[PDB]
Symmetry: C3
Subunit: 261 residues, 3 copies
Amino acid sequence: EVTQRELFEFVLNDPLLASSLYINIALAGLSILLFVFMTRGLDDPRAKLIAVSTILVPVVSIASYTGLASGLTISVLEMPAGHFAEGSSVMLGGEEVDGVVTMWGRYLTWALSTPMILLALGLLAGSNATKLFTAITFDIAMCVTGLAAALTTSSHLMRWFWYAISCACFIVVLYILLVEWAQDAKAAGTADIFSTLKLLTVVMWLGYPIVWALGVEGVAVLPVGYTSWAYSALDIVAKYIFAFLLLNYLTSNEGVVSGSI
Amino acid sequence: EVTQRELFEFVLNDPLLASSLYINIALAGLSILLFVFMTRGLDDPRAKLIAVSTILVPVVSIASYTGLASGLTISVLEMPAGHFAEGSSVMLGGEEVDGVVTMWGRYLTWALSTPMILLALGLLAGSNATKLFTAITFDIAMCVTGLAAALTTSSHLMRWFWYAISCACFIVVLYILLVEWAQDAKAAGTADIFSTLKLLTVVMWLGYPIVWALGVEGVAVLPVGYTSWAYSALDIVAKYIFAFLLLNYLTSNEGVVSGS
Amino acid sequence: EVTQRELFEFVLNDPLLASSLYINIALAGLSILLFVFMTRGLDDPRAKLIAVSTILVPVVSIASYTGLASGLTISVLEMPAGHFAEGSSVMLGGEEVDGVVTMWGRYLTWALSTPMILLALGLLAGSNATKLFTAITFDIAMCVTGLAAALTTSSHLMRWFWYAISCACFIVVLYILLVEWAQDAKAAGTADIFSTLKLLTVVMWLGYPIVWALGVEGVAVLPVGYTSWAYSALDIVAKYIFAFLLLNYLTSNEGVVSGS
Ligand SMILES: CCCCCCCCCO[C@@H]1O[C@H](CO)[C@@H](O)[C@H](O)[C@H]1O
Ligand SMILES: CCCCCCCCCO[C@@H]1O[C@H](CO)[C@@H](O)[C@H](O)[C@H]1O
Ligand SMILES: CCCCCCCCCO[C@@H]1O[C@H](CO)[C@@H](O)[C@H](O)[C@H]1O
Ligand SMILES: CCCCCCCCCO[C@@H]1O[C@H](CO)[C@@H](O)[C@H](O)[C@H]1O
Ligand SMILES: *C/C=C(C)/C=C/C=C(C)/C=C/C1=C(C)CCCC1(C)C
Ligand SMILES: *C/C=C(C)/C=C/C=C(C)/C=C/C1=C(C)CCCC1(C)C
Ligand SMILES: *C/C=C(C)/C=C/C=C(C)/C=C/C1=C(C)CCCC1(C)C
């Protein structure tokens, strides 16, 4: 019964929710412009690959956040028995609707952007194709099983089982970042910048499953609006500032990563 | 709740709609047969890569069009206030239903076929991996944001914002075709044939956002039936004749494109 | 009206259906741990690429089967006129509901796992990029048109048309497996292991379109519960035992697949 328009209007009229969404559409757009400008002098094909992969992060982000803001990738789901958000109401259109406003579109943002973050980092670290393939495939599995968890309403236990599977995939990604590429970067001559970006990425990425657990999808100590801002704040650092820092290094060290595709 | 059968029946009984879909299903099938025949002499792995990528175009087209013809990838959507198609109704089953018959399945056709056209062109021009990656990623973003625009019913302005984002992605693809690959093709020794396929692709591709703006998705000067035929006509040229021209060149110049 | 919980409960409380799903979740899970353990000694990057691609098979399987078991990837569809399952009922929850419980989630299991099976096999056979690309693309087309067939309710004949398209794509994959990779494997020095894996794959894969035609999706001689177990039994072989065999060889011939 809930229409896209009703959800679009619910987001508007809800200061927290509206701001957490529209601020990122704005920051993503500005980031694209800034990043394109910064990388204008790049000529080496390998350097340009790192640049495009990084720039695709805010491109995916602006489109995906528009998906949420428009109401296209938002749904109202009723949580299963025992879920801390069970029996919640939302007030849409004009009546009280059972369920929780679920911004599942965020998982699309993650599924399409995290592979680009990983591609950029792997290339920076001088990774071989095997580790890149492993990091990217498990990263995608992580995001998709996370979406499945959020979309599951049949059983409370099932939701957390998906969450556990997602975490396991996340561990694969963390192992590659912390152990494999950490060492590869030394041979690539990007040890300093990779270690910094590696640590920044690990710290911020760890925040997502924590927010999931604490937010409306998990134990719900954080209401819908606050869960959204938690994710948007993480996104601002894990995507935009992260990309700005990587591009800052790249544009001053093209020769170091020049090599060959 | 409109059924898949009701939309399938709607396509039928509606001349322009039925013809625009089934004629492309038929042409796609015939194209695949012809292309397979045309390329049985190929032996070079690189020449064969270009050939398979090209043949995948009509393969995606026949499956995707069947998705539309069957009603599977069609939905009825109610446009937002201010949209020229808002207030429209359609006869489905035994009742009048509010909304517009939306052939969103066409976006699946484009999202799966355009990357193959780009891959064939890039390989032909001797493009490096970075440019191929750039062209294909932005091409997919263009098709997906285009689909998002067609699926947005909450706000008229939002629909056009998606449209703008999609256009920006399109500009990236255009730049690579017109500037980068045009130059790369000279080193690959395929400057002439690339020039022909490039001109064809750029002109035809530019037609899609125009049809979008004029059709039911946009200001609706073109009814659902004319919108479909407009897109179908473009597909015939951008897909089938494009593929023929490329394959006709490939089968006579296998030596030129042969490589790593 | 049918909720996710109702389909979730339908699977549970139905010994046949529940066993066919939850058993594969367990086998997939145990397989991942077993394979990771078995390959812990690999050092060569090419060998590791084959191992990870193979390991992703049970990874996709455990996630996909959970999608089915949870009810997330299951729907209730009413078959079209003429379909042998037309006018069927099921009793979702405690009410008699028209249609057939359709576990379309299986197609996601296939579309995501088969490419990994093919990439592993192709690499083992020392396939060039062209054949890998050809096999994988037509394999995905096969899975997606198969899904389209299962999801089509507008026409009985349309379902079989999709089926035909999917079969045509399957033939392409079979040709690469049986003719081309069989030859490549010789030059790669993996002829004997490939022969074993090739036979197992061709035989098991042939079973799916057979189960489709015989099950509720096709002529419906096999009820929903038996159709599920038929696919599950095939999965156990085409995925888990196939993976064990490939990995057992891989870890014993790391040097051969490395090259230099
Ligand atoms: C910066 C991103 C650009 C997207 C801008 C989308 C916001 C458009 C909001 O429009 C307004 O919405 C109200 C509630 O639906 C209507 O009552 C009103 O008549 C309409 O004018
Ligand atoms: C690392 C994460 C830890 C996972 C924690 C998951 C525990 C939630 C279990 O759900 C509960 O299970 C009961 C028995 O099945 C149901 O009766 C009840 O209604 C349901 O709400
Ligand atoms: C990493 C985060 C850990 C997740 C912890 C989630 C545990 C959920 C506990 O909920 C409770 O479970 C009981 C059954 O055990 C129900 O009877 C009760 O009604 C329900 O409210
Ligand atoms: C390997 C992990 C797989 C997860 C399996 C989840 C099983 C949890 C079943 O819970 C029960 O489901 C019934 C029907 O919905 C409820 O009536 C009952 O109250 C609830 O306790
Ligand atoms: C731009 C977005 C970024 C960098 C997103 C990162 C997301 C994750 C690391 C998400 C991880 C999750 C789990 C490990 C468990 C289940 C839920 C998720 C999806 C939040
Ligand atoms: C076989 C199909 C082809 C070649 C399709 C091409 C499609 C495009 C070039 C579409 C472009 C669009 C925009 C630039 C703006 C928004 C709407 C679209 C999706 C029609
Ligand atoms: C792990 C799953 C595997 C190996 C699945 C293999 C599936 C196929 C070979 C399916 C083939 C089909 C056809 C050829 C015709 C139409 C229906 C299908 C999808 C069942």
